[PDB]
Each structure stands twice: as C-alpha cells, then as structure tokens.
Amino acid sequence: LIDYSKLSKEVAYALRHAPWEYGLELDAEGWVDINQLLSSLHECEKWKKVSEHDLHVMIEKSDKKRYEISNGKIRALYGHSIPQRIIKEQKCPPEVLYHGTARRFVKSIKEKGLQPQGRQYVHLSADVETALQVGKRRDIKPVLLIVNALEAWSEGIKFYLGNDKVWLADAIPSKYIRFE
Ligand SMILES: *SCCNC(=O)CCNC(=O)[C@H](O)C(C)(C)COP(=O)(O)OP(=O)(O)OC[C@H]1O[C@@H](n2cnc3c(N)ncnc32)[C@H](O)[C@@H]1OP(=O)(O)O
Ligand SMILES: Nc1ncnc2c1ncn2[C@@H]1O[C@H](COP(=O)(O)OP(=O)(O)OC[C@H]2O[C@H](OP(=O)(O)O)[C@H](O)[C@@H]2O)[C@@H](O)[C@H]1O
Numbered sequence: 001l002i003d004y005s006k007l008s009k010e011v012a013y014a015l016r017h018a019p020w021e022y023g024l025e026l027d028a029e030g031w032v033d034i035n036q037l038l039s040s041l042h043e044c045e046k047w048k049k050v051s052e053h054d055l056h057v058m059i060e061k062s063d064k065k066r067y068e069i070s071n072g073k074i075r076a077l078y079g080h081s082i083p084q085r086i087i088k089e090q091k092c093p094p095e096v097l098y099h100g101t102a103r104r105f106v107k108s109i110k111e112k113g114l115q116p117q118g119r120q121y122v123h124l125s126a127d128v129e130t131a132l133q134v135g136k137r138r139d140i141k142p143v144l145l146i147v148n149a150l151e152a153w154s155e156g157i158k159f160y161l162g163n164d165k166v167w168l169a170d171a172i173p174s175k176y177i178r179f180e
Contacts, residue, residue, distance in 0.1 A: 004058040007050060010041065011058070011067060015076040030075035030086045037074055065163045078162040081119050088121070088160035088168055093149035097124040097167050099177075100135030100142045109145070110179060114172040121160065121168035124149070130165050146178040 014022045014037065015030065022040035024032050034052055041047035055074065059067055067076055080086050099114060099122070114122045124147060125131035135142020152172055153159055160168040 002050065002054055002058075004054070004061055007047065007054070007058050008062060008066065010044070010047065011037070011055070011074075012076065012079065014040065015067065015074065016079040017081050019082065026075070026082070026084075026086075028084075028087045030077075030080065031070075031073040032075070034069060034072055034074045064165070078121070078123060078166050078168060079119060085120055088162070091159055091161050091167075093124075093153055093159040093167055093169075094126070095148070095150045097126065097147045097149040098128055098131035099124050099145040099147055100131035100133065101145060102135060102139035103141065103143055104139070106143055106179065109177065110174055113174040114145075114147075114169070114177060116171065121162075122170065122172055123162065124159075124167040124169060126165050126167065143179075147172060148176045148178070152176040 014024060015026070015032070019026050019032065022037070024036055024040060026032050034055065038050065038052060038055075041050050056069060059069065065077065066079070067074055101109065116122050123134070125134060128144060131144055132142050135144070149159060149167070149169075152169075157172055157176070158170045162168045
C-alpha cells in the first residue's frame with residue numbers, strides 16, 4: 001500500500017521548492033505535465049508503484065487542498081519558494097483574515113509586519129481554527145494574529161487566490177495586524 005501522506009510531502013517538495021531536482025520545469029502558474037512528475041518520482045524506489053490514479057487519490061484523501069490536477073497537468077496551489085514568482089490571480093480579500101504564528105516571531109512581526117520569509121507570498125487563513133493549526137506547526141501555544149485585510153487591500157496591499165482556506169498576500173505592514 002501507498003503512504004499517501006508521505007507521497008504528498010514528496011510532491012510538495014517537487015512542486016513548491018525544488019522542481020529542478022526532479023528534472024522538472026514549472027510553468028508560470030506552477031503547472032507541470034503529470035507524466036513528467038510520475039517519471040521523476042519513479043527514480044525513487046519508494047515511489048515506483050505510484051500511478052496517475054494514485055495522485056488523484058492522494059488529493060481526494062488529503063485534509064487540505066494542496067494540489068490540483070487538470071488536463072493531465074498538476075500544480076501546487078500555494079507554498080512555493082522558487083525564484084520565479086508563481087503568477088496567482090489577484091483578489092479582493094474578506095474584511096478579516098487570520099495568521100497563526102509562533103511566540104518567538106511576534107516581536108519581529110510587530111516591528112516589520114508579516115513578510116513572505118522563505119516563500120513567495122505571505123500565507124493567511126480564513127478562520128481562527130485553521131490559523132491556529134498553522135501556528136501549531138511551530139509552537140504548542142501559537143499566537144493568533146488578526147489581519148484587517150480589506151483595509152490593507154484598500155491601501156494598496158495585494159492579495160491573491162490560494163484556495164478557500166489559504167489566502168496569499170504581499171508583505172503586510174504591521175498597522176494592519178492585531179496582536180491582541
Ligand atoms: S527516494 C528519493 C526521495 N526524494 C528525495 O530524496 C529528494 C529530496 N527529499 C526530501 O527533501 C524529503 O524526503 C521530503 C520529500 C521533503 C519529505 O521529508 P519530510 O518527511 O521531513 O516532510 P515534511 O514533514 O518536512 O513536509 C514536507 C512538505 O510537505 C507538506 N505536506 C504535504 N502533505 C502533507 C501531509 N499529508 N501531512 C503533513 N505535511 C504535508 C508539508 O507541510 C511540507 O510543506 P513545506 O512547503 O516544506 O513547508
Ligand atoms: N517579519 C517577520 N519576522 C519573523 N517571522 C515572521 C515575519 N513574518 C512572518 N513570519 C513568520 O515566518 C514563518 C514563515 O513560515 P512559513 O513560510 O512556513 O509560513 P506559514 O507558517 O504561514 O505556512 C505556510 C503554509 O504551509 C503550511 O501548508 P501545508 O501544510 O504545507 O500545505 C501551512 O498550513 C500554510 O498554509 C511563519 O511562522 C510567519 O509567522
């Protein structure tokens with residue numbers, strides 16, 4: 001049987017972080033031919049059994065909509081770190097978005113605002129529980145930040161489509177972030 005969770009982590013690395021290591025090139029919106037991905041995964045002993053059907057199943061069973069398959073191509077919807085900016089659709093955000101973080105980063109976010117750091121975009125959540133889960137990746141007592149996203153947008157900060165639970169933004173100045 002396939003560990004679809006571990007397969008999902010491998011696909012994340014290929015489609016967000018190091019496509020070159022797989023001999024892949026992503027298009028401007030992040031897509032690659034799914035047969036080229038499968039061929040690359042089959043260089044790895046653990047993934048030689050993985051079929052195109054398995055990639056659909058991995059997506060269906062996942063707790064998050066990380067990837068999409070369309071007309072024989074696959075992309076990650078968010079998370080990228082590669083030098084070439086992934087073109088995402090600009091969108092007007094809801095009034096409020098959230099961002100869960102680690103206690104150890106709060107001072108720096110107060111001073112500088114939210115920054116993309118190792119990714120191309122700041123990632124934000126649509127609801128509190130989702131944001132706390134983001135923060136739990138780094139801190140058992142994560143900090144919830146509340147972003148006045150529509151105010152930021154009206155003052156020129158760009159936001160972009162990730163998926164229904166993950167919104168993307170350029171750097172967000174501190175004045176739009178509530179820490180309490
Ligand atoms: S046999 C040859 C295998 N391939 C290679 O050797 C090439 C380089 N391999 C690697 O770098 C690692 O083996 C990878 C593929 C990254 C897997 O290592 P980890 O077990 O440590 O994975 P992480 O926990 O660090 O997470 C990796 C990214 O995957 C996201 N993710 C996708 N799907 C899930 C699921 N179901 N559950 C948890 N996390 C998942 C992770 O959030 C993470 O995302 P980042 O963008 O890296 O933050
Ligand atoms: N000025 C500043 N100074 C200091 N620290 C600052 C800072 N600005 C921001 N930070 C913090 O710098 C960390 C960046 O960390 P990340 O790149 O991993 O971003 P993120 O945590 O949002 O996570 C992305 C997605 O990854 C996962 O998705 P998957 O499961 O992989 O699909 C999640 O669920 C997400 O959707 C975060 O703590 C920021 O708060």
